[PDB]
Design a protein around this ligand. Structure first.
Ligand SMILES: [Mg+2]
Ligand SMILES: [Mg+2]
Ligand SMILES: [Mg+2]
Ligand SMILES: [Mg+2]
Ligand SMILES: [Mg+2]
Ligand SMILES: [Mg+2]
Ligand SMILES: [Mg+2]
Ligand SMILES: [Mg+2]
Ligand SMILES: [Mg+2]
Ligand SMILES: [Mg+2]
Ligand SMILES: [Mg+2]
Ligand SMILES: [Mg+2]
Ligand SMILES: [Mg+2]
Ligand SMILES: [Mg+2]
Ligand SMILES: [Mg+2]
Ligand SMILES: [Zn+2]
Lengths: 56, 82, 51, 151
RNA sequence: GGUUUGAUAGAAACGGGAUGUAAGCACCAAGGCAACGAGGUGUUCAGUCCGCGUUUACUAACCAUUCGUUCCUUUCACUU
RNA sequence: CCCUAACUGGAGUCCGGUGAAGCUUACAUUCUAGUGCACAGUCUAGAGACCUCUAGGGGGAAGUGAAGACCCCGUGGAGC
RNA sequence: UGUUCGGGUCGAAGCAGGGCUGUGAAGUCCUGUGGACCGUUCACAAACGAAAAUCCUGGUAAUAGUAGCAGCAAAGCAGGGUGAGACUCCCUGCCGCCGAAGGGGCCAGGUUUCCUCGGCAAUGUUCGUCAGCCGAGGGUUAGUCGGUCCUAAGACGUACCGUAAUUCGAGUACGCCGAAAGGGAAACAGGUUAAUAUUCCUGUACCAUUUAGCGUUUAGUCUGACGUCUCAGGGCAAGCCGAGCGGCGUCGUCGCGCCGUCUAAGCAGCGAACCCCGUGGAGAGCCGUAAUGGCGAGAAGCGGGCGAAUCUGUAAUGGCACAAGUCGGCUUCACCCCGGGACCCGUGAAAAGGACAGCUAAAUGUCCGUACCGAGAACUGACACAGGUGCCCCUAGCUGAAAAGGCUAAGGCGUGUCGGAGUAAUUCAGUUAAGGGAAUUCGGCAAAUUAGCUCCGUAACUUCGGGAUAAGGAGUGCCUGCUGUGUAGACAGCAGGUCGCAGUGACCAGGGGGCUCUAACUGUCUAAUACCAACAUAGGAGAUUGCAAACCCGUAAGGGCUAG
RNA sequence: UGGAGGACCGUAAACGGUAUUGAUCUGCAAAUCAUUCGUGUGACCUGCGUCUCGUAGUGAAAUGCUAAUCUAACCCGGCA
RNA sequence: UUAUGCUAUCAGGUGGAUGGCUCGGCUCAAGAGCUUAUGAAGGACGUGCCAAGCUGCGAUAAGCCCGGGGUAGGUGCAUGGAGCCAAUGAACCCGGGAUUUCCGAAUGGGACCUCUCCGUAGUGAUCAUUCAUGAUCGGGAACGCUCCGAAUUGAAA
């Protein structure tokens, strides 16, 4: 058995579900937090200054 | 916010007019009790049960089994399905 | 027979009816300038991002 | 002819048989092409055009002849024995049948008064210990050492 | 190489070979009250088979075809 | 293995259909020797060489794959 | 760009070729095409000039009509159709593959692939009239199947507390979630469609909650509710045998072979073991089981109570060509009930729900899933991928210990989606090979040998357990007739006859032994070059710590070890 | 009689991956296929659920594994 | 009639460069500058006669009503068939309203379930108060304020 195509047929399950707040498939099913908008962790939307570049 | 959209007519839906049944397209947010009450308000005919199902087109189809005989044919004539 | 709730089946229903060609009269009206849209797909390909 | 495969599938689902057990009439192919519903297929099945072919099950006459010869004791020699002595007949079952026959014989002897409790207890412990090989061996030892109450 | 002025390949028969005595029938068979019975003997150096030969035109090697004319031209040695 | 032979099925060879990829500055029918950054099909001097196609296995193209992983260097790193 | 002078549908820019000028950068002109803008003087600016960066993007060659369309399942042929067109689609027959999986059921996943009709530009390793493709339309019906409810490992929320601060953090208190394979209130048979069916229809039922009438608590227990191994008894699906009955096959001779001969839940009844109660009186001991065992602290025996799977009766009219439809026997797993024993430095879940006070009537029982594939073509791996997910749970006859392998049913298929042809070398995988038998080679690498079962017999050495299937040998088929054990299935054994080169006749199936090194052993390991002597292991030894501990995490709150 | 064992043989049940240094190596496959092999009642295999993670986790310890990436992952940012 | 070929040109194919155009982009300047529990932004699903995407709208669903402008056609990107709307003045633009499913600060409990459970009908949490009522929660291109806070790199280390 290998790490390539042999063990990639075990991908019959999910770790991210479609989040309510943003409709993106980023809601982790174990931590209960969307990794795109942060629903289930915070009221505000997660946005960081490293998501774009320094404006200079 | 009426639960009833319109009667559902296919070859299979017209197969139940001899059975006193009549299949409708209803609001998908509705339940069996709301469909029963709104049909009884819209036509006055008494309903015996509701056989609901949601289809892959995004809709809900309800089959109302009436109690009085020939109510399905009367409703079809009043709507013009027949 | 994956067991969907109501919203999952509704999303799959919208995905199913999105996967249809453009109508003929749209192509005729647009002078054949609108002949496709990005939502065409085949079930035996990239899976839906639905559920 | 059109594709009669849909007709054959409907006939298989109406006759309750496999897809290739269906015998469509090659002569009356147009009639089978007309059959589009289950009532049409039922009419064709009842008129004889569409029938389910017989099951060609495995014959067993040679097997029954071999079974009768084996029951007599033949066709069972050491060239045909392939499994370990213990799989052909387990040892615990042999002990079970032997001891049950011995205990039943001793119980009947104590019941009809031919074997009192003092010698019946000893004979029961002897059968537990394996002194006897069968009911016949127990009877022969009884008639040799005279353990019955002859009167 | 042969091509009807023919034995080139095939069939039929025979010769020469391979295997080992076919099926059915008759008798015998250790026995079994019988029914049956592995098998033995006779018909039977049988039966089956031959990408080998001979005899034999019985069928098929027939019917054609194209090059050896630059190709149209009357740049012609033509034939309407 | 001495020492290979015969046979079987799939490839290959031939035919119909479908149908990519990798090397490639150019030319290129080569062979010998010399010269040249000291390992040349292309220079120099000779010798051979009519062209095209098919099959073959791999002598050569210092064959292709690839900014050498061995050695050194870098006032380059990482781990310990 | 400023400014001067201008060209253009009587044809601008650009594009291909050519003449002329210039050392040249380049300019200008001519021919063809084109259909709307384009230059120049004097000055000024720049995202201002490509031949190259294994440069970047696009288009396109040579290789080349070549490799592949073969190796793990070598599968197609005749006749008749349809069609403009047929190896490839349909029917029939013949010949075949799988047949403990390539069949049947379904989880996750897919998401319409399901079904009918019409097409073949692309997809399909060929073509194709075919299709999981293209286009159009249709398809999923629940009080009883699941989710829902319960809690488990464990998450999440509020508050407190911490933090510079939080969307960050351990603990505590209160909640709430967490299983489509744990627990769990109840439905079965037949019919119907193109596709739905314990859901729709026919028949016969059952469960829950609330409302009303009739009365009560026993209210604290029991059940839910428990590991591994082994085994007895009982039942039953599936399987098998004999008689009768009804069809099909074979029929050169024979009289056999195959199929069928069906009957659900619900309701009513009996109840095997275990347990309990009333009697009883057992020792120079008795009663039992497969086995362990039991007994004056009361056995056997006799009664009684509680008490299963299934079975019987009804459901009795449903389907079966309204063709029979009636009977007996054997066996029965791996399925159900019930009981015993053994093991643990493993002790093998909790909660909802359910029983003990219910009986009758009526009404209500919302919401979600339900199609189809579940895999050599419907999932995942870029694919119609020889992998993986799933061999996860079931699987009939013969041989046989067997679910091994071989041959056949049912069922699924001829799509592990290219064909013809039979003419070299070479190649992948096999069969056989005289005489020799490791002379090959780093090395018996590869291949070969042996192989099942019964019986005889079995060495060094040893931790006394083993080595051991050691080694070395014999027998084995078929037919005739019997014996013994067992209740029975079946098992074991004997006598005689007989065929062949060969009787585990195929399939299946160890070659054996000796001397060293190393590690005790079973196990673990570089997924994708290292299955080793390495790692772990039990065993041995050492060290810290008396619990507000030793050791460790955190900035803190507070934690792991520790329900110690 | 009994039915103990990190017991034995053994499957194309399941798990593992010895040798052929075979096939394949622009593959069926970014490690698969054939034959040959090891375990196969337990330190067993495995479904689903849940938890432990970047100077951190996990590791019967190879610097192995942590989504084809590991002597310090991946994504974006410091970064032109 | 010399094939396979070689070079130059020509015609055609494949192709989409150059030229021309352009409702886009970028940069600079000038104004104006908050919104949200009276439920936002954002998202899911629905929404058209034939409607797949985008856009708009929300079961009154490419829309409804009222005041002003405009006035002859309208029926989105997108002048197709058939209808509909409009001289009772539409379409369109400005202003004011209505409707505004589910999630989302999301707020009655719950989320691998954008839906689901209880309905006793929902003010979830933290707060102020006369306990009538009220505040905060989210979003906003950057800017503003407070606090925490690296390394590459330069010094040719
Ligand atoms: Mg910045
Ligand atoms: Mg439903
Ligand atoms: Mg280098
Ligand atoms: Mg230096
Ligand atoms: Mg260039
Ligand atoms: Mg071929
Ligand atoms: Mg077979
Ligand atoms: Mg094709
Ligand atoms: Mg729950
Ligand atoms: Mg070891
Ligand atoms: Mg060690
Ligand atoms: Mg083993
Ligand atoms: Mg990896
Ligand atoms: Mg970077
Ligand atoms: Mg520096
Ligand atoms: Zn989100």
């Amino acid at each position: 058995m290998s790490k390539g195509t042999s063990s990639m047929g075990k991908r019959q399950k999910r770790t991210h579900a479609k989040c309510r707040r943003c409709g993106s498939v980023s809601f982790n099913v174990h931590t209960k937090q969307c990794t795109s908008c942060g629903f289930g962790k915070t009221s505000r939307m997660r946005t960081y200054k490293w998501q774009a570049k320094c404006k200079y | 916010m009426s639960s009833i959209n319109y009667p559902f007519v296919t070859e299979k839906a017209m197969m139940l007019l001899d059975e006193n049944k009549l299949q409708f397209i209803v609001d998908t947010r509705s339940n069996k009790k709301q469909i029963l009450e709104d049909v009884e308000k819209m036509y006055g005919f008494k309903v015996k049960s509701v056989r609901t199902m949601t289809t892959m087109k995004g809709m809900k189809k309800a089959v109302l089994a009436f109690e009085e005989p020939e109510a399905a044919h009367e409703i079809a004539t009043r709507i013009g399905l027949m | 027979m994956s067991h969907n709730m109501k919203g999952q089946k509704k999303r799959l229903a919208k995905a199913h009816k999105q996967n249809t060609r453009v109508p003929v009269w749209v192509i005729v009206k647009t002078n054949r300038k609108v002949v496709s849209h990005p939502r065409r797909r085949h079930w035996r390909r990239r899976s839906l991002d639905v559920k | 002819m059109s594709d009669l495969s849909n007709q054959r599938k409907l006939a298989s689902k109406v006759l309750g048989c496999g897809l290739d057990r269906v015998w469509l009439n090659p002569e009356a192919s147009e009639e089978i092409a007309s059959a589009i519903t289950r009532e049409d297929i039922r009419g064709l099945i009842e008129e004889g055009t569409i029938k389910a072919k017989p099951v060609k099950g495995v014959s067993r006459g040679r097997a029954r002849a071999l079974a009768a010869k084996r029951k007599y004791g033949h066709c069972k020699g050491h060239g045909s024995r392939k499994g370990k002595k213990g799989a052909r007949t387990p040892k615990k079952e042999q002990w079970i049948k032997k001891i049950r026959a011995l205990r039943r014989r001793l119980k009947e002897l104590r019941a009809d008064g031919a074997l009192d409790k003092s010698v019946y207890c000893r004979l029961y412990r002897k059968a537990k210990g394996g002194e006897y090989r069968s009911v016949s061996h127990l009877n022969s030892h009884l008639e040799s050492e005279k353990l019955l109450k002859k009167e």
